[model samples]
Every structure is written in structure tokens, then in C-alpha cells.
Target: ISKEYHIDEEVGFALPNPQENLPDFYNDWMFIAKHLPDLIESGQLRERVEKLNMLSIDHLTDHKSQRLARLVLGCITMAYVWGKGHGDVRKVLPRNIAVPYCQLSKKLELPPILVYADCVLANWKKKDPNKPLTYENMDVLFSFRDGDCSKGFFLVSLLVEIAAASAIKVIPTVFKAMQMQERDTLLKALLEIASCLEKALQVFHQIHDHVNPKAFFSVLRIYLSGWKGNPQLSDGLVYEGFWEDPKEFAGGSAGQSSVFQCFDVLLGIQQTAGGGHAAQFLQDMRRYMPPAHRNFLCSLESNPSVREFVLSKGDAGLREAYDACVKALVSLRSYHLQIVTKYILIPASQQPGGTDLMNFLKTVRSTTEKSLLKEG
Candidate 1:
């Protein structure tokens, strides 16, 4: 009864006074929103991103409640991948974090986004297959009204689902350019990617603060992090960065995932002014993108054809694509700027991290804005 927790016994964390799991907490709507929460807050919400807080889960004792918490954490962890910030994407999901988080996902019928990325998205067969949406031939992820799947969170899960789908479609299409025609088929893929960006931003904004911002920034980021391996780790330690060693899984994370680079690829936006900052951003960003995707885009960049095709084919050729594509960029960036102001700017001035990071993001956003409509 006197077993207290501490780091090497210097100071200790006391057990609950009356031996309760978590502090006094509520699992009700506003309470769950505040803490041991349920996903269907506004009524049948998405499953992944907004499940339950750790503190609240700690308080749970019933089998159903505990499993429900696992489901929430599982979805929350996966959502972190796409929504994490830029450079954060390069870092691996530290084993201390990945092993459990990933296992939780697998246990709850959810795979970490990292698993989904290389396992599902990377395994795409261009020859066409059944259910382009999942690695598992699962038509539906199944439903459980008792063990764990009883109360499914559909709303937030919708965000990660669509966002991942949005991301998955762009890579293969870009690569197909080498085998297929650049002006038509590849152009069409780029357009779909453009549309994906808007839909993605819409979902992420809903949970900017509703979920665990810290874990969201940390864990999910590991999935999205690039294979730059750049600030390379010692390998002496275990890394859950998935796999890029075959030179295949190497790809983009969070900021590097889709949208921006895809826009540049489709429109042929040359790295013009403010080259110093944007140039570095792009270089680091590539590590975050999928290697096949990065390599494919590199091939296209090395010898761009969209702009050239438009010039010779007439204004209707790539111009329509370009116009529509640029508009999407503006829309996405506009939404991103909102995140910068709300999450980054305000948080930096009144939170952890540093002002320098806040400034760096500012430049990245500014540079992106400048390059948006510029002539290639």
C-alpha cells in the first residue's frame, strides 16, 4: 500500500489517495471532451483521432471501457502521422513509443499509419486490384458492438481515412508518367491530388486542439517522417521508422506528404525567389516524401514536360490544369496559414518549443505563398 512511483527514488508520484485509477474524471460528453471521453461527441464521430485521454483511460476498470480506450488511442495514434508538422516527419517513432502504439493498433484491428503507408500504399499494384483502399482485402474494417468495435468513432476516423486515401493516389500516378503519358494521365492524377489537399485540411482543422497535440506532434509524425534517416540515428538503437533500407520505402511525411510538391510537379513552378530558405525546405522535405514518389518527381523535375506540353499543345493543355492546381494550392495554404496562426504562432508565444521554430515555419509558409502563382 506504500508503493509509490519515482525516478530512482529521488522524488515519488503518490498513488491515488483512496486508490482510484485516475483522478476524479468524467466520461460524459463535455467530460469526455474534457477527459475518459467517447468519440461520438456530436453524435457518431470518427474512430481514430478523438478517442479518450490517457488519464481518463487510466481510471477505467471495466473490460469494455478499457478496450474502448485502446480503440480511441489506436485511432488517435494513426491520425498523428498525417497531421504532424514538417521536419518532425523525418524522425523515427522511437521504440519506446512505436512498440506499444503499433501493438495497440494491431490489437484493436487498426494498424499504425506507418504500417498502412509501406504495407498498404507502398504495395499498390498498378495492374489494378480489388479494393484500392486497403492492404487487407477488407471491404469494411468490420464492426463490434461489444468487445471493442461496439461504439465506432466515424467522424474523426473519416479525416484520417480520406486524408490517407488522398495521399495514396498521388504517388503512383506521378510514377506512371514514365510509363504513361505526362500531359494526360499523369496530369489527371495530379488533379486528384490537388482535390485531396482541400479535403485533408478540412479534416485536420477539426482536431487541431481537440486531441492530444503533443502526442499528435510526436507519435503520428514518426509515420510521416522521411527516410532521410538525415539527422541519422546510431542504428545501435531500435528504430520504428518502418523500412526505407531497400531504397523503396523512402518517402515524405506530414508536410512533405502531398499537395505542395505535387502542385509544383504538375505546374512546373521553378524555385525562383527567396531561394535560400525555400531551397532548404524543399531539400529536407524530399526526405519526408516517399522515395519512389520523390524519385519519380525528381525524374519529372529533371525533365519537366507539363509546361513544355502546354506551350506547344495550346493554352488549354496544361494551363487549365495549372490554373485549377494553383487555386488548390492557394486554398490549402490559406487553411495552413490558419493553423500557423492558431497552433504554431499562438502556441510558440504562449507555450513550449521555441520562437525560432515558429519563425522558420513562417518563412516556409511565406516562401510557399510567393512561389504559388509565379511564372515557371
Candidate 2:
């Protein structure tokens, strides 16, 4: 049976600070080296760590500088472990980094040496449950897996796919609210959905061409084709019958169901290859389409029909789709940013000749265009 730790009362143990009196610059470094042993030995460490992981969002929300540093250390330790291990280290390192490290430490069955370090840094005392990282808060703590600290083509692609799924979740909720004939509620939901999609677009643009522009366009093309009619807007914006070809829109039952099916396929690809090489294949697929096609599909957000359909779904389905899409996008952005920062930018920045800088800049430019083109 799993052990559960209560947070309501004070425990006898004192929270140790291995980096006590250390300069801010050295705190993270010292914390890692000094606390590895104490953390591993405590009998109550796992329970305490769980309590702390539950509090991370609060730390983030309150901008607790000290707490954030500790969290970072925990993440770094987790990253270091996976980086040294076998089995998709690149993917594993980021995944470890993104989740609450202490939780992962327990899950991975690491030695107390590694596990204890995470507890000291990532756990926190409970004060207000309403605060960020509190029990009730749903704020996601990202790491290398979520693309916060590492980078690679596969990671970046996964992030995009996740963001798209998040959007799908939200769109249906908004549309469902509209179906209820609640105009005001529908408008509010739509605006929120728009904001989310916009943010996803920004991130998508930032990393689109860096990996695969063509695949990105293909995803958008299918999405746009789904919104071709329903008294929402003109077909000109999103390609009225873009999928008319038997090859493109070959599935049975046209309309909303067809749209849902397409989304399911796209989302399935993302879900199936949540990590590793499968994730990389999805990224490579983005490289096939022309830049213009990508730009056109990205531009469908401006389409009235697309917007209307999204708004028409009512609260339940609309929000669901929106959330899924947002999750996918955030994951994709974080992944790509990691790749650029870790694999491309960091190395290139450290190099003397600056040879990779031009290529990097070009990729960024192309990605930006694709992003804007897809804005909805």
C-alpha cells in the first residue's frame, strides 16, 4: 500500500537547506550536491515530496523566488538522471524535467540519493489552498517532457500536436454553449477560445519551419476543410471544398462528424507517438508541404465560418476541444523552444564562427509566416 502524508499538522522533521547562506548563483549547484544524501534517507521523504509537488503551482503563482529555485533544482536533478540513463534520454530528460520531479523520482524508483534531493527542493509548506500549486489548482508544471528545459525536433512536434488537441477540446465546448442559445455565454467562450488559438498560433509560428512546414500545413489543411459550410462564413477563406477530392476527404459522413473524425485522426497520431522516435516522425512529416500552403491553412482562423462553428458548439464540447488544442500547442511550443535553445541556439551561440546563426534565423522567419498564416 502507498503511504499517505497528512499536511494539516506539523511534522517533527526540519526542512534542511543544503545551500544555506549560499549565494543565489551557487544555490542551485550547491543544493544538488549537498542534499542528495539527506533527501534519500528520510523515511517520510516520498510523502513529503508529494505534498510539495502539490504545492508547486502555488509557488509559481506567488512568485516565490526561493521556492522556484528549489523547484528548478529538483527538475535539474531529474534531468541529470535521465540524461545519464539509456532509453530515449533526450525525450526522457525533458519529460522528467517537465513533471514534478519528486513525483517522477518516486515513480522511476530512483535511489534515495536522487529521490531525496527532489523532496527538499520541490516540496513546500501548505498555507492557502487557493494559492497556485495548491491541491485544487490544475496548473501544469512543465519540464523537458513538456519542453521547458530541453529541445529537439520530436519534442517540438509533440508540443504542436498536443496544442492542436487542446484547441479541439475548447472549440466543442464553446460550440455547445452556442447551441444552448446562450448568446452572451457563447460570446465569452468564443473570445476565450480565440485567445487560446491565437497563443497557440504564435508558438506554432515560432517553431513551424524549424522542423517540418509541410506537415504543419497538412494538419491545418484538414482542419480548415472541416469548416467548409454550415452558414458560418464564406468558403474562400478556408477552401470551401479543399477536401472534395476522394483522396483528401474520402471518409464517409460529411459535416461535423467528418470534422470530428479528421480531428481524431490527427489527435491519434499525436497520442500514439507521445514520445521518442514516433514523435520525430510526426515532425518530419511537416517538411513536405510548400510554404504558401502552410500560410493559407494557418490563415483560416480569420475565417468567419471557422470562428462561427467554433462558437456554435456550446459550452461543454467547445471548451473540451479548446483545452485539448491548447495542451497540444503548449506542449509543441515548449518542445521546439527546447530544441532551439538546447540543440541549435545554445551550441550555435557558443560557437566562434556563428555559421548556424543564419540558418536558424531563416527557420525562425519561415515559422513566423506559417504561424501568422494559421492564426484563427
Candidate 3:
């Protein structure tokens, strides 16, 4: 391995091209995608998508173009299936969309369904190229509803990823420190990771300022919903001729974000909340992430972890620093639950699947707190 800062040429887990504007060759695809929100609101998404000419993925020769294709196809696919409502979910995707979606998903090493990698990581751009990558300057390239609220829900998520940039960049340094057994260097880098997590916590809180809870639950959440574990789509959707049977895929979720997974892997945290489904759910989510990012986590796990280094040295300063990172993660997960309470719990109490959602998240948060080093 080069051991250099990877994940989009120093941008960390964010996409290389922030805007993801494809070339003119793909204008046919982009035409409908650009009007996704308006079309969905008017109940014309299905009609519009059904009539689209099947575009070839052959012209999408580059990573950015392929990613844009994936994002567009994923959005159209979700809107088609869920635009009308869960009560009347479409069970079959026409060959026009299904063919290329499955093809590109295979090439990109992601699922055909819309995922967090497409929705959050590869879906943003700066208002002005020269400006900071903060939320105010960031804009969501695609959304189910047109407004500040949906944009905020996405941009806030992007900001959290940007906040973790430094930590991801310094990971190689931590790995290097482990190889050399440099305790002091490792301690310093570990603290920097903790600081990054603390800043990410602040960025995550801005979701409340941007997205209205009522709007998020009422309008946007359904589009983000996936066929997997979804009661409405009990048998999943048919991808036309691509497969002999229907396939279920998870929806776009923050759980698919590699930033937090990297943090967990680095700190050696085990997500065995319920000990079975919880752990299996997380392992399943990894398949939804970008393959390179997923491979990065695996490589990090293969290394001599920072947690083992600190435990082995029995150094007080190193232990405290390691504990700080775990505490910061615990706080982050704890705050995330508070957000879920407002956006999901309060709005959908009487709805099905509410209890299991809260239970899973609460157990995961407890797992984070459990990772803290014991005080002697």
C-alpha cells in the first residue's frame, strides 16, 4: 500500500467531483433527473420515467460520470417505486431503468438501489468553487423535495464527513506510529482523531436548524426508504430481465457512511448490540458503501490497532487519550439518537417498525460507551 492519504484525492470520504456534472453525452439521463423533486410532487414521476429512452452506460467511461449515472438512476428508481406512496408500491422496474442501474451498480461495486454513498457522499457541490466546504456553501444536487429543509438534511450530513477529513488523513500516520512502536506519536494522532469527532458532533447538530421534523418524516423519509426490511415491499422489486427473482436492498442511511465505520474500526469497537441482528445489519450495510472505502476499513482492521497499542503499553496518558476518542464517539451516537427521536420516533409512534428502530440505535450507542477504557 502507498500508505498515503486516500479516498478521493485528499478529500477523504467525500466524492472527488463535488458537483458531479456529467458531460453532454448523458444529457438524456440528466434531463429527467434534474426535475426529480418537481416531477415527484406532481405525481408524474412514474409516467416520466416509464417513457424515458434507454440510455447506454457505455459513454460513462470515467468514475465521475459513472457515479452521476448511479445517482440519477438510483433517484429515479426510488421515486418510481415510492412516489405514489407505500400503499401502492410498484413491484417491477421497467427494463429501461433497471438494465443500466444493475449494470452500473455491478461496475461500481454497489447495489442497484439508492444508497447513502449515492445520496450523501456523491451528491453535493459548492455554491462557489472558491469558498469553504461549509453547509451554507454546499448544495444537494438531488433531492425528493425542493426546499431548504431537504437541502439542509443532506448538506449537514456532508459537513460531518468534511469534519472527519483530518482524522482520515492522519490515519496513515497512526498506522505508521504503530509499526514503529512510537507511543508518543500514536497518542498525539489519536487525540487529533478525537478532536475531529468532537467537531463532527457540532456539525451534526445543525440538522435541527435546517430540516423541519414534520417535513422530513412526512415527505422525504419515504423516498429514502429501501425495499429491504420494508413491510410494504414484502417480496422486493423485480429488476426486469436482470435477475430471475426479486431482490431487496437497504435504503440510503447514515449507517452506510464510512466515516463512522472507520472510527469504529480504528478504536476497535464491536457493534454487537443485540448480538445477532444488530451486528449482521452493520455487516450488511458495509456492502452499501463505496468498495474502496470498505476496503480501507478492512485494511485498517488488518493493522495493529491503536487500542491494542495503548493497552499493551500501559501508559496513563495514552489510555486517557484513547478513552477520549471513545467518549466522543459515545456522545456522537447519543446525540444521533436524540435526532432520531424527533425526526423518526415522535412523528411515527403509531406506525409499524418504530420500536425496533429505536431499540437498535439505543443498543448501538450503549456499545460505543462500552468501548471506554476502564479506570484503575
Q: Which candidate ranks first by lDDT, i.e. highest? A: 3
Residues forming the 10-long window of minimal summed lDDT in candidate 3? 1-10
lDDT (Cα, 0-100) at 243 in candidate 2: 23
**True-vs-predicted CA distance for residue 8, candidate 2, Å:** 21
Evaluated at residue 304, the lDDT of candidate 3 is 75
What overall lDDT, based on C-alpha atoms, would model 1 receive against the true structure? 0.40
For model 2, residues 1-376, the per-residue Cα lDDT tens digits are: 0112111111111121212232444433444334433443343322333233222322222223443444445444343333312222221222222343334223333311222112322233333444532223312122223222212232332333334343444544444564566656655654564455455455445444444433322221121121123122223111112222211111101111112122323222222134544334323332222222223222333223433345455555554544444344344434444544544445445536123333433343333233221232
Tens digits of per-residue lDDT, candidate 1, 1-376, equal: 1121110111011100111122245333223222212333233333332343323233556533433334333333323322323332223444433444445444433334332222222211212243342223222121212122211122233333446355444554665573465667756765676676667666656554343434333333343333223343323122254333322223323344433455565556554234675556666555544344456556556554555555565646456555555566556556656654554455445544335445655565554455443343
User: Each model's TM-score?
Assistant: 0.42, 0.26, 0.93
Winner on lDDT between 1 and 3 is 3
Give lDDT: candidate 1, residue 139: 21
